[model samples]
Target: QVQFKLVLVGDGGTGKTTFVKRHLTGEFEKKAVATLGVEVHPLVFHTNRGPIKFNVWDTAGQEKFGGLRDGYYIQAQCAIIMFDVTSRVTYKNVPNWHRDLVRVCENIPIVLCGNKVDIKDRKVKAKSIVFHRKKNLQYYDISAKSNYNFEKPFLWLARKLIGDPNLEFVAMPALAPPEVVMDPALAAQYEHDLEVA
Candidate 1:
């Protein structure tokens, strides 16, 4: 089995954990609390090339956890730079995360994930697209809540790491859905924003 170490980094509350959970369990949490430091999840995918396992590191995005980030970023074969689509501030911080990541893991494949596209008020504007083009990074618009385009990021990263552009994989059955508690306040906030716009 081929094993890869992948890291996820972004602003706090950007849905990094939710994305990982959805991919592994096929379920979405209405409210996901902030990651304290880093959570490591082992995800195995049955691919045509072989059995591939990803040791995914979901890092805490809050500034308080910044000191511990480099240790988790070390030895990562690939990474996902995620941002909440509804928050321009989070989108603006992508470069900072990217810079920090490359400092520790140079020349690794990175995918830019714009999460929460299912939300109606997306603050990431067209100019933000230049970030990917400028960095020659792969980009994907995904919604962890809706299970939309969820697997493509990992599949693309797997192909890059294996040096096979056409690699394919058949996902094993998902695990039992985990109990996810959604914060009513956040849910109502999203609802209110949609109504205002």
Candidate 2:
């Protein structure tokens, strides 16, 4: 068994809470309420290599709305910074979030996810996303609303954190009837992405 603390961050409305629900319950949040501060969520994945646990520290995007501060990130071993694709402002703030994480966590396997790709008005195009390239962090496109590519982000972080390229998740440690089922084409693309990346 292996365990690591995972920090999840982004602008408040970037769907960080929504993304965490999928990892927590294997279901989409029907109505996501306004969340504040840092939350520790235990996520376990039964992988092909072995069982892995991630205590995901779900942090607030805005410091003023939260109770805790940078000290909450003191022991994070990995992280994911998400940005809502439909909102340009979320993507624009990636640097600030990245800066904060590296300042505290340092040298961890941090990933960047562009969320809400299910929306038609997603202004952040595939061609325009470049934050991850600059920081050498792995990136993924996700739609928390549709459960699309949800596991891709976590799986990548898990592998990198555990130093196992061949690690695979056999279960979410909990699986419910997910609200939005990932389609075959999207599914194939994600697999190809994990393979190539």
Candidate 3:
């Protein structure tokens, strides 16, 4: 079994817990309360090659919990910085959430998810939501209410962070020329050289 840590950070009313439940169990807890400080959930799902387990940390959206948040980010492999599509204020807070991730966990994979996409009355058009204002983070528009594309974002994060060699779809491709066929020993040497540079 391979274990992955995913932290969800965002402002209040962003549906972090809702997304988790929808993805894990295909149904949200009807009485689920807003996370007060941090709620932890362990989800295990079977993959073709192995069992994938996620230690998901759902942090409170209130700024008072700032101090409590960093500890959860420690050793996190991937993160989803959520924003409620209906709330422009929630979307505005994304930069700060991202900055927190940078301070606590550097060089980890991150995905930005616009939650509550199923609320037709309040839905924000995906094409109009601008992500380029901040650093180019991988982004997904999803609805926890309807369980739309919630699993996709998490799966993408796992594939990227775990460096699954066999995970072709959604994995970052090789940057070098396709013609360059380095032997296994040479490839290792090349990686070491790049790291030292």
Candidate 4:
């Protein structure tokens, strides 16, 4: 099985926890208690190419937990940056989340998610589209309560991390990707490079 570490970060009340619960369990809570620090959930999907598991880290978006976020971000392979569609302040905070995420986990694939699309008074649609294009990031407008496009974001990230854009085309039962382990010498070289830089 192939495994990946993915994280969700956004402003509080943007539905990050709700999205994960809905996607993994197929149930949505009317009101989810705010995450205290971080919640880790394991989800496995059996695709045509065998089983793939995601170790999803749902983070607390409150400012009080900001200092503890870096440790959660380490070794993450991908992330979902979400915002509430009806809240302008949540949408505005996307850049700050992105900056903090990349500062710790560089070069990881990220997708921008606008949640709560079931709400009628939306203020983030047009501006989010522009921001997504400008930043060259994949964007999805989804509703966790309504279960719209719930799987697309995760599938997209999985494909990107596996380096298989045409993964769907080869959707037959097959072996998983080989296990990856860095050679000790290569790791030492990388450590040296980082220290020198």
Q: Could you estimate the TM-score for every candidate?
A: 0.78, 0.81, 0.70, 0.75
Q: Which stretches of candidate 4 lie over 4 Å from their true place?
A: 24-36, 60-68, 169-197
Once fitted onto the true fold, the runs of candidate 2 whose alpha carbons sit more than 4 angstroms away are: 24-36, 60-68, 172-197
Worst 10 residues of 1 by lDDT: 25-34
| Residues 1-197, model 2: lDDT tens digits | 57787878888788887877766442232222234355667677788888777777765555435323656778788888888888898888889888888788778998899987666565887667878888788888887767777777779987887778998998655533457655667556544754564
Question: What would you estimate as the lDDT of candidate 1?
Answer: 0.73
Considering TM-score, which of the candidate structures 3 and 4 is the better prediction for this target?
A: 4
Per-residue lDDT of candidate 4, residues 48-101 (tens digit): 566676777776555534534467778888999998878898888889888877
For each candidate, what is the lDDT?
0.73, 0.73, 0.63, 0.68
Q: Rank the candidates by lDDT, best first.
A: 2, 1, 4, 3
Best by TM-score: 2
Ranking by TM-score: 2, 1, 4, 3
Q: What tens digits encode model 3's per-residue C-alpha lDDT throughout 138-161?
A: 777666665555466756766776
Tens-digit per-residue lDDT, 1-197, candidate 1? 67888888888889887888765532232223244466667777778888887777765455534534456777888999998888888888899989988789978999999888766666874445558888989887777776666777888898998998988877653743434433455445544553453
Question: Which prediction has more favorable lDDT, 3 or 4?
Answer: 4
